[PDB]
PDB file of C-alpha atoms in Angstrom:
ATOM      1  CA  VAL A   1    -103.868 225.757  45.283  1.00  0.00           C
ATOM      2  CA  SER A   2    -100.378 224.699  44.261  1.00  0.00           C
ATOM      3  CA  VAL A   3     -98.844 227.267  46.603  1.00  0.00           C
ATOM      4  CA  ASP A   4    -100.672 225.793  49.604  1.00  0.00           C
ATOM      5  CA  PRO A   5     -98.594 222.573  49.630  1.00  0.00           C
ATOM      6  CA  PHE A   6     -95.445 224.491  48.657  1.00  0.00           C
ATOM      7  CA  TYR A   7     -95.239 226.686  51.745  1.00  0.00           C
ATOM      8  CA  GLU A   8     -96.721 223.771  53.729  1.00  0.00           C
ATOM      9  CA  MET A   9     -93.908 221.409  52.909  1.00  0.00           C
ATOM     10  CA  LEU A  10     -91.186 224.093  52.826  1.00  0.00           C
ATOM     11  CA  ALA A  11     -90.131 225.344  56.247  1.00  0.00           C
ATOM     12  CA  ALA A  12     -88.238 228.346  54.934  1.00  0.00           C
ATOM     13  CA  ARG A  13     -91.390 229.368  53.102  1.00  0.00           C
ATOM     14  CA  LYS A  14     -93.468 229.576  56.249  1.00  0.00           C
ATOM     15  CA  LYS A  15     -93.104 233.239  57.160  1.00  0.00           C
ATOM     16  CA  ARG A  16     -95.805 234.276  59.627  1.00  0.00           C
ATOM     17  CA  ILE A  17     -97.191 230.730  59.746  1.00  0.00           C
ATOM     18  CA  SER A  18     -93.929 229.259  61.055  1.00  0.00           C
ATOM     19  CA  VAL A  19     -93.731 231.456  64.082  1.00  0.00           C
ATOM     20  CA  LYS A  20     -97.528 231.182  64.579  1.00  0.00           C
ATOM     21  CA  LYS A  21     -97.311 227.361  64.464  1.00  0.00           C
ATOM     22  CA  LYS A  22     -94.620 227.388  67.226  1.00  0.00           C
ATOM     23  CA  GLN A  23     -97.192 229.218  69.354  1.00  0.00           C
ATOM     24  CA  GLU A  24     -98.775 226.250  71.103  1.00  0.00           C
ATOM     25  CA  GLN A  25    -102.084 227.304  72.680  1.00  0.00           C
ATOM     26  CA  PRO A  26    -103.158 226.139  76.176  1.00  0.00           C
TER      27      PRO A  26
END
């Protein structure tokens, strides 16, 4: 549960989530 906010706040942490987030759906 402590890792959720970590990778959430950290940009360098977001591995597959970072690129996925940039993928804005229609």
